[PDB]
Amino acid sequence: GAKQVDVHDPVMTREGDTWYLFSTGPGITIYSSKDRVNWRYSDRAFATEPTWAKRVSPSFDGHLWAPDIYQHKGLFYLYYSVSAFGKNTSAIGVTVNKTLNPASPDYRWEDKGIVIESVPQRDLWNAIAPAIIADDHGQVWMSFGSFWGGLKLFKLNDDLTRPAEPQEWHSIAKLERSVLMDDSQAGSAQIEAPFILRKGDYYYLFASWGLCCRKGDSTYHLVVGRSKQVTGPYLDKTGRDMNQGGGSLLIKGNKRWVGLGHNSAYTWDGKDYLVLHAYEAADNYLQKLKILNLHWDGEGWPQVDEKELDSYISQRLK
Ligand SMILES: [Cl-]
Q1: How far does residue 179's CA lie from ligand 1's centre (Å)?
Q2: Neighbouring residues of the ion ligand 1, judged by CB less than 5 Å
């Protein structure tokens, strides 16, 4: 290729011998790769935009946020966020395809509409940044959230397009906020973008703390907690519940990478990987894809080598 690939809020999956990468961007931006390093543009999920997006977000600009990709019964489920900066006029949608290869006769994204929507003054959460997790009991869950009253988990219905009925919800992580604050304001609870990975006997909840998207002043970083059951509670290394501000440091930025986060995490062929964006100080703070090897310490906690922020170098192909 020649330049690193620029992404925000990345997720990944493999179909056959091809890797696919999904990013925040117009219609959700999709790339493909044979080796996880050299990436070509593949498609955008929506050629224009979801038919319903403007009614949720009247000033919608075409950019969909924070995708999650999930394989289930032979299909590909791509969750995506419609929102507006600074507000909780937001909704998570899902669109489904039979395959990820755009040359395939089976290739077509079909929107299934709104999974969940937040409404100002009704909901103390923000319906963005979905992540899908299955448990040991045949059930599938969505975690999501950003600012307001924090991160939530709810049970999905049988087709994975709406909340199961009757509904079942759980709070999984939170930072301080008084309800006397105006309901329309994001607050000081700088927590977002949950992602859950099952490893050994625990579920691990990753979350982003601090502020993204602000050049030299970004404080964005990753913290983690763990729970025996998918529904919590997620505790940190000191035994503090993430519902009361717990979370142990996984990785933070340095002089070259000022802010990093909004991660995913995967087990591929018996090894584990952390997938994130990081803002490159030497290139106008432009967010680059980073894939790091995910290790586990003697106490059962994830660990990464921050040197891989430099040695993992994606390439954008023609
Ligand atoms: Cl995400």
Answers
A1: 27
A2: 66
